[PDB]
Amino acid sequence: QFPKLREWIGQRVIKDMAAQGYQITNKLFESTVGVKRTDIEDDNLGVYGPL
Amino acid sequence: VDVYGNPIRTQQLREPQTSRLAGLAKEFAQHPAKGLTPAKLARILVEAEQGNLQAQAELFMDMEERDAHLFAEMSKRKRAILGLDWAVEPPRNASAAEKADADYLHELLLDLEGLEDLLLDALDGIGHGYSCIELEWALQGREWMPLAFHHRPQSWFQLNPEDQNELRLRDNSPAGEALQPFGWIIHRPRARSGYVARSGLFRVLAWPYLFRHYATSDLAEMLEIYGLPIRLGKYPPGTADEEKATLLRAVTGLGHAAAGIIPETMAIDFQQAAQGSSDPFLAMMRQSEDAISKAVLGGTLTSTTSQSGGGAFALGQVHNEVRHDLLASDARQLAATLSRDLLWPLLVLNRPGSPDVRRAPRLVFDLREQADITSMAQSIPALVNVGLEIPSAWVYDKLGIPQPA
């Protein structure tokens, strides 16, 4: 942004804006588990399949 | 208030009762039909008698899904009702105000979307013994409206420990939760006299379903074994493991392979695999299917089919006995439930005053049976020439033709 009002219109002093930047990497996140194909079918109680 | 007299508070109508029970909406059916044995079925039924309706409801859902004959019968029975025309009539010798109330209710039901879905959801109580449909109440200014009808699974409820005929929500507490007034349309058709747990038709139909399932599975297994014979190879002492494996593979592939050679010291014996017929299995399946047909739709048209044969009185012959009785019973029970649950809140919220409960309008289904126009049209002229003064109202009502306006 712009700085304070100075105290001299005689011999005015120029200024510049500062360009700021922020860099961030969006790396992935994961998590998983292994299960057997027969066991999910060989489970009549409803558990092992709410996975 | 409601028909039962329980105090009614409009504050609780803004939100559904089950909204504060987000746990229920995340549940999945346990599918108790898979791996079901007669002992397991008996335990399920007995536990349901004691207030554990979750397992019974899930079993009934699986039974409906896994049996094509039972599903077809139930769907036909329900579609019979879904196709009936309906009307709202004012009470006996109603006054002008009552007639206006009935007319307004009729107009409101006509313009209420989702009525057919509501009827279909309610008819599930025929097989499950009880169906609960949650109401969404909204205000379009000064008049309450049912925003939508939500059918909640029967597995979401239980029995009151202090009352075996009163249902309650499953809120993790031993006593459950009482049903909110004006928040549900509970349909509980009564095929047999008893408690709510024992009142379902699927309770009657469970055993034939299990018989048919066992017969079909056994037949499928026997068809799998059918074909080639079991053949056993024998080897002498001093046969090494590699030769044993070679003999085993030869025997395993011998059925598919037309020819093979073995040493004279070995031997292969072809033994009977499975010799019989499908007659016992099919007999059991037919018995179970006939039982299901009789229990669902009557033993005059479905199981012991009425056969063909037309005629003017053929409609009456096919319908009046069995089919008309069942249709009228189901329609009357559904109409009573609707008049009790949906018509009354609309009358007592959307209109001024406190009309007496006995004078509430009643929803009526059109059970009129098509009458032979030709025979009766032949008959009238003789009677009128004789001198009888038959009213025109009876004719117009019975023929289905409307009175001139």
mmCIF file of all heavy atoms in Angstrom, chain B residues 34 45 47 53 65 80 98 131 155 165 169 173 177 202-203 225 232 252 266 275 305 370 383 389 398:
data_model
loop_
_atom_site.group_PDB
_atom_site.id
_atom_site.type_symbol
_atom_site.label_atom_id
_atom_site.label_comp_id
_atom_site.label_asym_id
_atom_site.label_seq_id
_atom_site.Cartn_x
_atom_site.Cartn_y
_atom_site.Cartn_z
ATOM 1 N N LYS B 34 -28.586 -63.648 3.937
ATOM 2 C CA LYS B 34 -27.454 -64.452 3.496
ATOM 3 C C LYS B 34 -27.041 -65.413 4.603
ATOM 4 O O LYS B 34 -26.895 -65.016 5.762
ATOM 5 C CB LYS B 34 -26.282 -63.554 3.106
ATOM 6 C CG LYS B 34 -26.038 -63.457 1.606
ATOM 7 C CD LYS B 34 -25.414 -64.729 1.048
ATOM 8 C CE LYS B 34 -25.352 -64.698 -0.472
ATOM 9 N NZ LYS B 34 -24.594 -65.851 -1.032
ATOM 10 N N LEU B 45 -37.400 -64.270 14.245
ATOM 11 C CA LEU B 45 -38.815 -64.016 14.498
ATOM 12 C C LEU B 45 -39.089 -63.855 15.988
ATOM 13 O O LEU B 45 -39.814 -62.939 16.401
ATOM 14 C CB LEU B 45 -39.660 -65.145 13.912
ATOM 15 C CG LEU B 45 -39.588 -65.306 12.393
ATOM 16 C CD1 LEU B 45 -40.281 -66.583 11.954
ATOM 17 C CD2 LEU B 45 -40.194 -64.102 11.695
ATOM 18 N N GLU B 47 -37.017 -62.940 18.397
ATOM 19 C CA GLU B 47 -36.459 -61.677 18.865
ATOM 20 C C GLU B 47 -37.320 -60.502 18.421
ATOM 21 O O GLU B 47 -37.517 -59.546 19.178
ATOM 22 C CB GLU B 47 -35.029 -61.516 18.353
ATOM 23 C CG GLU B 47 -33.984 -62.186 19.226
ATOM 24 C CD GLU B 47 -32.580 -62.007 18.691
ATOM 25 O OE1 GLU B 47 -32.438 -61.668 17.496
ATOM 26 O OE2 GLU B 47 -31.617 -62.202 19.461
ATOM 27 N N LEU B 53 -37.057 -55.186 16.076
ATOM 28 C CA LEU B 53 -37.616 -55.190 14.732
ATOM 29 C C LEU B 53 -36.583 -54.919 13.646
ATOM 30 O O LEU B 53 -36.899 -55.086 12.464
ATOM 31 C CB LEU B 53 -38.736 -54.151 14.635
ATOM 32 C CG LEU B 53 -39.849 -54.257 15.678
ATOM 33 C CD1 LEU B 53 -40.876 -53.159 15.474
ATOM 34 C CD2 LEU B 53 -40.516 -55.620 15.624
ATOM 35 N N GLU B 65 -36.398 -58.807 -2.009
ATOM 36 C CA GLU B 65 -35.487 -58.606 -3.133
ATOM 37 C C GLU B 65 -35.106 -59.926 -3.802
ATOM 38 O O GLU B 65 -34.998 -59.992 -5.031
ATOM 39 C CB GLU B 65 -34.239 -57.865 -2.656
ATOM 40 C CG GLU B 65 -33.250 -57.525 -3.751
ATOM 41 C CD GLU B 65 -32.061 -56.746 -3.229
ATOM 42 O OE1 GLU B 65 -32.008 -56.495 -2.007
ATOM 43 O OE2 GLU B 65 -31.179 -56.384 -4.036
ATOM 44 N N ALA B 80 -52.525 -52.886 -7.929
ATOM 45 C CA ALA B 80 -53.982 -52.922 -7.975
ATOM 46 C C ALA B 80 -54.575 -51.713 -7.260
ATOM 47 O O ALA B 80 -55.485 -51.055 -7.776
ATOM 48 C CB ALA B 80 -54.493 -54.222 -7.355
ATOM 49 N N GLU B 98 -69.287 -27.834 6.118
ATOM 50 C CA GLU B 98 -68.593 -29.110 5.989
ATOM 51 C C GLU B 98 -68.353 -29.458 4.526
ATOM 52 O O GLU B 98 -67.286 -29.974 4.169
ATOM 53 C CB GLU B 98 -69.395 -30.213 6.677
ATOM 54 C CG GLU B 98 -69.486 -30.064 8.185
ATOM 55 C CD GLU B 98 -70.533 -30.976 8.796
ATOM 56 O OE1 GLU B 98 -71.667 -31.011 8.275
ATOM 57 O OE2 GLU B 98 -70.221 -31.656 9.795
ATOM 58 N N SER B 131 -45.834 -49.277 8.224
ATOM 59 C CA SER B 131 -45.062 -48.356 7.401
ATOM 60 C C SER B 131 -45.179 -46.956 7.982
ATOM 61 O O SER B 131 -46.285 -46.499 8.286
ATOM 62 C CB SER B 131 -45.549 -48.367 5.951
ATOM 63 O OG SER B 131 -44.721 -47.559 5.134
ATOM 64 N N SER B 155 -36.537 -50.602 9.997
ATOM 65 C CA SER B 155 -35.440 -50.905 10.905
ATOM 66 C C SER B 155 -35.114 -49.751 11.843
ATOM 67 O O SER B 155 -34.317 -49.934 12.767
ATOM 68 C CB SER B 155 -34.195 -51.282 10.101
ATOM 69 O OG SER B 155 -33.794 -50.220 9.254
ATOM 70 N N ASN B 165 -47.823 -52.697 21.401
ATOM 71 C CA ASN B 165 -48.524 -52.209 20.221
ATOM 72 C C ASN B 165 -48.124 -50.789 19.841
ATOM 73 O O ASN B 165 -48.703 -50.226 18.907
ATOM 74 C CB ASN B 165 -50.037 -52.271 20.443
ATOM 75 C CG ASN B 165 -50.671 -53.491 19.812
ATOM 76 O OD1 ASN B 165 -50.369 -53.840 18.671
ATOM 77 N ND2 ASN B 165 -51.561 -54.142 20.549
ATOM 78 N N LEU B 169 -39.011 -44.586 18.004
ATOM 79 C CA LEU B 169 -37.760 -44.418 17.284
ATOM 80 C C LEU B 169 -36.592 -44.973 18.092
ATOM 81 O O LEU B 169 -36.643 -45.080 19.322
ATOM 82 C CB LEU B 169 -37.512 -42.943 16.973
ATOM 83 C CG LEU B 169 -38.127 -42.390 15.686
ATOM 84 C CD1 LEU B 169 -37.501 -43.045 14.466
ATOM 85 C CD2 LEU B 169 -39.633 -42.580 15.690
ATOM 86 N N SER B 173 -31.618 -45.096 23.417
ATOM 87 C CA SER B 173 -32.105 -45.308 24.770
ATOM 88 C C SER B 173 -32.959 -46.569 24.840
ATOM 89 O O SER B 173 -33.547 -46.985 23.836
ATOM 90 C CB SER B 173 -32.929 -44.110 25.246
ATOM 91 O OG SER B 173 -34.236 -44.140 24.701
ATOM 92 N N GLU B 177 -38.008 -43.453 21.498
ATOM 93 C CA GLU B 177 -38.615 -42.130 21.500
ATOM 94 C C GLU B 177 -40.023 -42.226 20.936
ATOM 95 O O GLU B 177 -40.241 -42.889 19.919
ATOM 96 C CB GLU B 177 -37.783 -41.143 20.676
ATOM 97 C CG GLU B 177 -38.440 -39.788 20.485
ATOM 98 C CD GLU B 177 -37.445 -38.701 20.134
ATOM 99 O OE1 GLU B 177 -36.227 -38.977 20.160
ATOM 100 O OE2 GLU B 177 -37.880 -37.570 19.832
ATOM 101 N N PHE B 202 -45.196 -61.043 5.607
ATOM 102 C CA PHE B 202 -43.923 -61.718 5.403
ATOM 103 C C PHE B 202 -43.622 -62.698 6.523
ATOM 104 O O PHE B 202 -42.884 -63.661 6.304
ATOM 105 C CB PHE B 202 -42.790 -60.698 5.281
ATOM 106 C CG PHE B 202 -42.834 -59.877 4.022
ATOM 107 C CD1 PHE B 202 -42.407 -58.562 4.029
ATOM 108 C CD2 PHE B 202 -43.293 -60.417 2.832
ATOM 109 C CE1 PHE B 202 -42.442 -57.802 2.879
ATOM 110 C CE2 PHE B 202 -43.331 -59.660 1.682
ATOM 111 C CZ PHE B 202 -42.904 -58.353 1.705
ATOM 112 N N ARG B 203 -44.183 -62.490 7.714
ATOM 113 C CA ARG B 203 -44.021 -63.478 8.773
ATOM 114 C C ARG B 203 -44.664 -64.801 8.382
ATOM 115 O O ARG B 203 -44.132 -65.875 8.685
ATOM 116 C CB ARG B 203 -44.610 -62.948 10.077
ATOM 117 C CG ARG B 203 -43.668 -62.022 10.821
ATOM 118 C CD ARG B 203 -44.167 -61.709 12.212
ATOM 119 N NE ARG B 203 -44.149 -62.878 13.083
ATOM 120 C CZ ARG B 203 -43.257 -63.101 14.039
ATOM 121 N NH1 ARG B 203 -42.259 -62.263 14.270
ATOM 122 N NH2 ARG B 203 -43.367 -64.196 14.784
ATOM 123 N N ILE B 225 -22.838 -80.599 -10.286
ATOM 124 C CA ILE B 225 -22.130 -81.877 -10.191
ATOM 125 C C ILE B 225 -22.451 -82.768 -11.390
ATOM 126 O O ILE B 225 -21.609 -83.559 -11.828
ATOM 127 C CB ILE B 225 -22.444 -82.578 -8.856
ATOM 128 C CG1 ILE B 225 -21.512 -83.771 -8.650
ATOM 129 C CG2 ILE B 225 -23.877 -83.049 -8.812
ATOM 130 C CD1 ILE B 225 -21.531 -84.320 -7.241
ATOM 131 N N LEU B 232 -11.834 -92.604 -9.848
ATOM 132 C CA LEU B 232 -10.770 -92.701 -8.860
ATOM 133 C C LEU B 232 -9.654 -93.579 -9.404
ATOM 134 O O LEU B 232 -9.906 -94.696 -9.868
ATOM 135 C CB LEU B 232 -11.306 -93.278 -7.548
ATOM 136 C CG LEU B 232 -10.333 -93.362 -6.372
ATOM 137 C CD1 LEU B 232 -10.284 -92.042 -5.625
ATOM 138 C CD2 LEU B 232 -10.729 -94.493 -5.442
ATOM 139 N N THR B 252 -7.789 -86.189 -13.322
ATOM 140 C CA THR B 252 -8.519 -84.926 -13.297
ATOM 141 C C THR B 252 -8.972 -84.524 -14.695
ATOM 142 O O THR B 252 -10.109 -84.078 -14.880
ATOM 143 C CB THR B 252 -7.642 -83.834 -12.688
ATOM 144 O OG1 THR B 252 -7.146 -84.272 -11.418
ATOM 145 C CG2 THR B 252 -8.427 -82.553 -12.502
ATOM 146 N N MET B 266 -1.878 -100.040 -12.765
ATOM 147 C CA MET B 266 -2.771 -99.037 -12.214
ATOM 148 C C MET B 266 -4.217 -99.389 -12.553
ATOM 149 O O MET B 266 -4.502 -100.370 -13.244
ATOM 150 C CB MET B 266 -2.403 -97.652 -12.742
ATOM 151 C CG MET B 266 -0.984 -97.228 -12.412
ATOM 152 S SD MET B 266 -0.721 -95.460 -12.623
ATOM 153 C CE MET B 266 0.926 -95.285 -11.948
ATOM 154 N N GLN B 275 -27.074 -89.372 -9.553
ATOM 155 C CA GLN B 275 -28.110 -89.978 -10.372
ATOM 156 C C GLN B 275 -29.447 -89.817 -9.670
ATOM 157 O O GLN B 275 -29.614 -90.251 -8.526
ATOM 158 C CB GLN B 275 -27.810 -91.457 -10.638
ATOM 159 C CG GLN B 275 -26.527 -91.690 -11.431
ATOM 160 C CD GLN B 275 -26.481 -90.893 -12.724
ATOM 161 O OE1 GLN B 275 -25.461 -90.291 -13.058
ATOM 162 N NE2 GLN B 275 -27.592 -90.880 -13.453
ATOM 163 N N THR B 305 -55.519 -71.286 -10.606
ATOM 164 C CA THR B 305 -55.940 -70.219 -11.497
ATOM 165 C C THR B 305 -57.379 -70.429 -11.953
ATOM 166 O O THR B 305 -57.832 -71.556 -12.171
ATOM 167 C CB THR B 305 -55.010 -70.140 -12.708
ATOM 168 O OG1 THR B 305 -53.646 -70.185 -12.268
ATOM 169 C CG2 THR B 305 -55.236 -68.846 -13.484
ATOM 170 N N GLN B 370 -67.565 -52.524 -12.676
ATOM 171 C CA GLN B 370 -68.217 -52.321 -13.963
ATOM 172 C C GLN B 370 -69.437 -53.223 -14.085
ATOM 173 O O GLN B 370 -69.330 -54.448 -13.973
ATOM 174 C CB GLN B 370 -67.232 -52.597 -15.096
ATOM 175 C CG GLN B 370 -67.791 -52.317 -16.483
ATOM 176 C CD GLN B 370 -68.512 -53.512 -17.077
ATOM 177 O OE1 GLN B 370 -68.160 -54.661 -16.812
ATOM 178 N NE2 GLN B 370 -69.529 -53.245 -17.887
ATOM 179 N N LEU B 383 -89.352 -52.853 -16.915
ATOM 180 C CA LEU B 383 -89.745 -52.438 -15.573
ATOM 181 C C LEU B 383 -90.483 -51.106 -15.601
ATOM 182 O O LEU B 383 -91.496 -50.934 -14.915
ATOM 183 C CB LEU B 383 -88.514 -52.345 -14.672
ATOM 184 C CG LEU B 383 -87.723 -53.642 -14.483
ATOM 185 C CD1 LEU B 383 -86.401 -53.369 -13.777
ATOM 186 C CD2 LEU B 383 -88.541 -54.664 -13.711
ATOM 187 N N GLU B 389 -91.159 -46.949 -10.518
ATOM 188 C CA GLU B 389 -90.486 -45.653 -10.595
ATOM 189 C C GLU B 389 -89.086 -45.815 -10.011
ATOM 190 O O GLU B 389 -88.836 -45.564 -8.831
ATOM 191 C CB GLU B 389 -91.293 -44.582 -9.864
ATOM 192 C CG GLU B 389 -90.551 -43.267 -9.632
ATOM 193 C CD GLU B 389 -89.821 -42.764 -10.866
ATOM 194 O OE1 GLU B 389 -90.467 -42.617 -11.923
ATOM 195 O OE2 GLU B 389 -88.603 -42.506 -10.774
ATOM 196 N N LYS B 398 -74.614 -46.214 -10.479
ATOM 197 C CA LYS B 398 -74.161 -47.587 -10.678
ATOM 198 C C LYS B 398 -73.486 -47.756 -12.035
ATOM 199 O O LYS B 398 -72.536 -48.535 -12.171
ATOM 200 C CB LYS B 398 -75.343 -48.548 -10.522
ATOM 201 C CG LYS B 398 -74.972 -50.022 -10.658
ATOM 202 C CD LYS B 398 -75.157 -50.564 -12.061
ATOM 203 C CE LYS B 398 -76.617 -50.690 -12.423
ATOM 204 N NZ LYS B 398 -76.809 -51.186 -13.802
#
